[PDB]
Amino acid sequence: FKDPNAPKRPPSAFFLFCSEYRPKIKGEHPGLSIGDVAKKLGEMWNNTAADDKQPYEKKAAKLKEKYEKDIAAYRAK
């Protein structure tokens, strides 16, 4: 009975980035703390050229156009 209404909203712009830059650092650092992981990721991200953030923000825009597509019927709380 998967209610078509009940949707899912995009995560954080940099969350989509974390998964990408998480193995690189954690790779050479198989002991990062959830704090470090997200902190450093935040640094590289923050440092990521605005033009390089395109794929990520753009991605969110793809599933977003899809989101609001059926939400018009769903609610908001």
Domains of the chain: 1-77 (1.10.30.10)
Largest Cα–Cα distance of the chain, in whole Å?
Answer: 47
Distance CA 58, CA 38 (A): 21
Please, which residues have CB within 8 angstroms of residue 13's CB and are 6 or more apart in sequence?
A: 53, 56, 57, 60
Which helix (H) or strand (E) is 40 found in, with range?
helix 34-47
Measuring CA to CA, which residue among 52, 50, 51, 62 is closest to residue 20? 52
Method: NMR
8 A C-beta contact, residue 60 and residue 16: yes
